[PDB]
Amino acid sequence: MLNSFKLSLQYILPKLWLTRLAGWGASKRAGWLTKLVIDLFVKYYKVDMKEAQKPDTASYRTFNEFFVRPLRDEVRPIDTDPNVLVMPADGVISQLGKIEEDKILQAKGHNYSLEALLAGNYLMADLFRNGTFVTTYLSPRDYHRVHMPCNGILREMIYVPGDLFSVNHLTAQNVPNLFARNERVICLFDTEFGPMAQILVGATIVGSIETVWAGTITPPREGIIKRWTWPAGENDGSVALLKGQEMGRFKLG
Amino acid sequence: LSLQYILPKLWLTRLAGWGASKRAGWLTKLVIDLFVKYYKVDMKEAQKPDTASYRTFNEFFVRPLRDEVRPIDTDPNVLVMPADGVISQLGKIEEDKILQAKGHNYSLEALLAGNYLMADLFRNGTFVTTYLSPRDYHRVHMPCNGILREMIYVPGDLFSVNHLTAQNVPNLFARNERVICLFDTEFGPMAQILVGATIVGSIETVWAGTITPPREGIIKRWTWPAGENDGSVALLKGQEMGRFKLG
Amino acid sequence: XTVINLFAPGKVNLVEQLESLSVTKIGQPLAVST
Amino acid sequence: XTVINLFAPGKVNLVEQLESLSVTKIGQPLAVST
Numbered sequence: 429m430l431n432s433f434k435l436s437l438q439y440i441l442p443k444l445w446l447t448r449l450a451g452w453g454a455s456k457r458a459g460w461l462t463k464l465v466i467d468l469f470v471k472y473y474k475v476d477m478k479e480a481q482k483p484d485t486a487s488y489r490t491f492n493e494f495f496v497r498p499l500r501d502e503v504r505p506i507d508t509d510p511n512v513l514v515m516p517a518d519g520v521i522s523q524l525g526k527i528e529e530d531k532i533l534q535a536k537g538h539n540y541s542l543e544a545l546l547a548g549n550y551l552m553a554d555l556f557r558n559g560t561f562v563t564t565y566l567s568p569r570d571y572h573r574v575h576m577p578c579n580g581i582l583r584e585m586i587y588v589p590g591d592l593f594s595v596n597h598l599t600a601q602n603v604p605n606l607f608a609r610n611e612r613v614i615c616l617f618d619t620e621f622g623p624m625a626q627i628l629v630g631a632t633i634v635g636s637i638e639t640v641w642a643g644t645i646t647p648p649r650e651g652i653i654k655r656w657t658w659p660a661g662e663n664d665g666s667v668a669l670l671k672g673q674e675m676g677r678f679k680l681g
Numbered sequence: 682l683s684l685q686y687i688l689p690k691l692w693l694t695r696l697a698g699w700g701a702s703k704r705a706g707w708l709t710k711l712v713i714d715l716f717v718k719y720y721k722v723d724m725k726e727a728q729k730p731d732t733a734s735y736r737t738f739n740e741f742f743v744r745p746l747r748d749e750v751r752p753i754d755t756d757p758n759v760l761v762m763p764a765d766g767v768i769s770q771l772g773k774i775e776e777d778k779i780l781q782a783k784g785h786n787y788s789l790e791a792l793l794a795g796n797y798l799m800a801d802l803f804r805n806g807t808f809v810t811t812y813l814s815p816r817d818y819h820r821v822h823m824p825c826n827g828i829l830r831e832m833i834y835v836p837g838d839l840f841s842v843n844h845l846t847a848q849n850v851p852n853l854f855a856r857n858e859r860v861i862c863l864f865d866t867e868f869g870p871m872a873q874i875l876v877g878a879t880i881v882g883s884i885e886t887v888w889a890g891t892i893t894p895p896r897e898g899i900i901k902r903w904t905w906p907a908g909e910n911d912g913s914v915a916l917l918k919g920q921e922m923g924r925f926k927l928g
Numbered sequence: 929x930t931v932i933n934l935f936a937p938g939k940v941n942l943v944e945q946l947e948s949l950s951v952t953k954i955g956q957p958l959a960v961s962t
Numbered sequence: 963x964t965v966i967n968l969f970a971p972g973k974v975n976l977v978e979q980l981e982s983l984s985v986t987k988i989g990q991p992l993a994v995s996t
């Protein structure tokens with residue numbers, strides 16, 4: 429119905445082979461060539477290296493080291509009202525607002541299912557029916573680690589296999605279920621504000637997802653849904669994170 | 682084995698589906714005759730043994746048989762085979778573990794797309810994996826009377842589902858596109874899972890028609906009420922419940 | 929294609945002569961109540 | 963990339979000035995308890 433070369437590429441391109449290839453290159457200690465790619469990236473995407481702990485591009489041994497570069501604490505002060513949930517990621521708001529029954533906005537006019545986002549987990553969907561959602565978009569120029577909006581006890585993590593569509597205005601408007609079909613990690617926490625999900629969704633090239641408690645979840649890509657549980661916070665074996673603390677990140681591969 | 686990872690399995694599936702849905706007269710008939718030749722199809726078993734009788738290749742692929750050629754066992758204590766072909770593997774579910782091939786296990790939870798509550802129904806139970814080939818009848822029939830409770834469409838890959846891939850591709854049945862059907866029966870809760878493969882990627886049930894294509898990349902769950910309720914769906918032992926075709 | 933059946937524990941016995949590569953036909957015996 | 967947050971009904975109000983293309987910075991306000 430829409431006749432777009434770019435949309436066709438999303439379906440035509442071997443997005444996974446490209447993601448693997450880029451992950452291979454981004455893991456190489458390639459000295460001057462590593463440094464060149466980083467300098468060209470920083471120039472083309474207008475990265476603010478002043479915000480990084482190591483502002484010198486020669487300090488990074490691999491591209492991925494640079495892509496996941498840490499910031500200076502002082503440059504992201506954590507709001508101190510314990511009634512304030514804070515932004516988990518640097519970037520822009522894609523969409524946000526009320527979950528209209530099961531319905532989340534992907535773009536103006538274009539909905540998707542909460543149950544579909546949560547891989548058919550109707551019991552976890554029930555926690556969030558008629559609740560609230562925020563979708564943050566991280567770009568190549570942004571810091572690529574993700575932090576807690578509030579204190580949380582980790583209860584549940586679900587790895588979901590999927591595609592590696594690009595994320596932009598064309599895909600957000602034209603690929604149905606973009607965030608519900610792309611590879612992703614669902615994290616469920618107990619918080620003071622009730623149950624909270626923080627879902628990390630991959631994209632072409634930026635396909636690798638880590639959490640601080642499990643390391644790299646993907647790659648490799650084994651094709652199946654995997655579920656992990658943790659007990660309530662009063663119990664041995666529980667996992668606890670503070671507001672503003674790092675909980676995961678994205679990288680190439 | 683290398684081909685399985687390189688080949689654009691879904692492009693090939695879509696292409697074949699397009700061709701197999703065309704009312705293409707002589708060309709339809711040619712492809713059917715070549716298929717019947719190459720795969721040694723027994724057309725004596727079909728209701729319409731005449732290959733000109735089929736307006737599309739898919740019509741032929743899903744050709745009905747004559748009742749008399751598949752008598753349904755009569756003991757109401759006997760569950761019958763759902764599909765023509767060969768047993769791939771069968772036996773006990775070892776806790777969460779199902780045998781794919783010698784030396785290859787897979788997770789019941791992974792087969793059921795993370796549905797731990799449906800996995801609990803079958804922990805330490807029994808499983809049967811039937812393999813249908815291109816020569817076989819491609820519709821699937823009830824092993825006993827059942828009330829449909831739950832259907833789950835699961836997106837995935839379209840690996841080929843032969844003895845070589847069964848031996849070499851980890852989680853083959855848990856990663857391939859598939860439909861999970863859950864029934865109440867006299868013998869307790871029972872699943873009949875229809876798993877697709879390269880080219881043969883289209884899955885129907887009699888109650889919902891074609892589930893896939895299209896391929897929208899999300900898990901979809903449908904529920905039906907208990908028996909003798911409005912909107913209830915009930916099927917008899919040996920009755921058709923679904924099928925596979927190209928696309 | 930492939931069809932996978934699951935039955936709850938202790939509900940059926942597979943007919944004993946079925947093993948890997950046994951020929952299947954719709955309507956033939958697969959398992960019996962316990 | 964993408965991060966999606968889900969919160970239970972009645973539990974938070976989004977900061978009222980946030981909309982599509984609002985700049986996000988880790989540690990800045992996103993929502994308040996009710």
Ligand SMILES: CCCCCCCCCCCCO[C@@H]1O[C@H](CO)[C@@H](O[C@H]2O[C@H](CO)[C@@H](O)[C@H](O)[C@H]2O)[C@H](O)[C@H]1O
Pocket residue numbers: 450451453454455456457458461462465491680
């Ligand atoms: C997507 C981002 C792309 C970033 C740029 C990618 C460029 C890829 C170039 C491919 C070749 C680089 O491959 C890289 O070769 C150099 C050789 O100098 C090796 O370098 C390593 O071993 C050699 C000795 O054997 C040492 O002198 C060197 O100090 C050490 O870091 C790396 O172990 C290897 O990873």
